[PDB]
């Protein structure tokens, strides 16, 4: 969530604290998890 460390709720609501984001109608975690491993040829023990 960030560098917060409070278990209590915030005093100011949500919109006097941050700037509200708006939807309209991530990558490198998908890129680093599709990494090839193992070998390329027939391995032995």
């Amino acid at each position: 969530s960030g560098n917060t460390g409070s278990i209590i709720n915030n005093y100011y609501m949500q919109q006097y604290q941050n700037s509200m984001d708006t939807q309209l109608g991530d990558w490198f975690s998908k890129l680093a998890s599709s990494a090839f491993s193992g070998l390329f040829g027939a391995l032995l023990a």
Binding site: T4, Y16, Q23, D26, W27, F28, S29, L31, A32, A35
Partner: protein, 220 residues
């Protein structure tokens, strides 16, 4: 009466890394939308693990040249993220802002010779405690690996993380000049008509590489 409190002493000073958030002053701001915008990364290790970056050799070059003589040591560099060879790597770019790490460091080895030049290489990990090996006979007794140049021209060797302690310092000590974390040696064993031809090397974060305890020690 009113609710009595005790204005406690020692607490409440301004700390620069605290999880206290500042009181707002200007509300009701709606940002322009940003959703599904391309190229987002979340953690700095995923950039360091999915994108390998070159090393540094003698002559400000990333490639190492095959050697047509009796000496067979292509490169022999100490294993630290404050090393001379690792300096231009992105992996040692963000490891300049931390104190200690653990985990594997992938090294990627792409051979850029012509289709008639063939060679085979080896890379060994010499743990600290005695002098690093200078011949591929002596370096056969390390945790090594060999590969030869054929159709698939790239080789990835994951450096093991061997240590007494659970975490090792990413900053090599200023006074202590023995480099007691380890050496990594890569040789050539033979080559066929591979004179003047190159072996460009790369480095990436490993599968289980994770850093720890960020500091700000001014960007050398």
């Amino acid at each position: 009466g009113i609710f009595p409190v005790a204005c406690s002493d020692g607490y409440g000073g301004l700390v620069t890394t605290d999880p206290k958030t500042a009181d707002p002053a200007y509300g009701k701001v709606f940002n322009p939308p940003r959703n599904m915008l391309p190229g987002r990364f979340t953690n700095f290790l995923d950039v360091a693990e999915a994108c390998p970056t070159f090393l540094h050799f003698e002559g400000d070059v990333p490639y190492v040249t095959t050697k047509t003589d009796s000496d067979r040591v292509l490169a022999q560099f100490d294993l630290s993220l404050a090393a001379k060879h690792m300096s231009n790597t992105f992996l040692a770019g963000l490891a300049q802002y931390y104190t200690q790490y653990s985990g594997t460091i992938n090294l990627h080895f792409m051979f850029t010779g012509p289709t008639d030049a063939k060679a085979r290489y080896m890379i060994a990990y010499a743990p600290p405690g005695m002098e690093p090996p200078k011949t591929p006979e002596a370096a056969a007794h390390c945790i090594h690996a060999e590969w030869d140049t054929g159709l698939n021209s790239k080789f990835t060797f994951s450096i093991p993380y061997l240590s007494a302690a659970d975490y090792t310092y990413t900053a090599s000590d200023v006074a202590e000049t023995t480099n007691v974390q380890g050496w990594v040696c890569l040789f050539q064993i033979t080559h066929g008509k591979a004179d003047g031809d190159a072996l460009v090397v790369l480095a990436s974060a490993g599968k289980d590489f994770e850093l720890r305890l960020p500091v700000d020690a001014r960007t050398q």
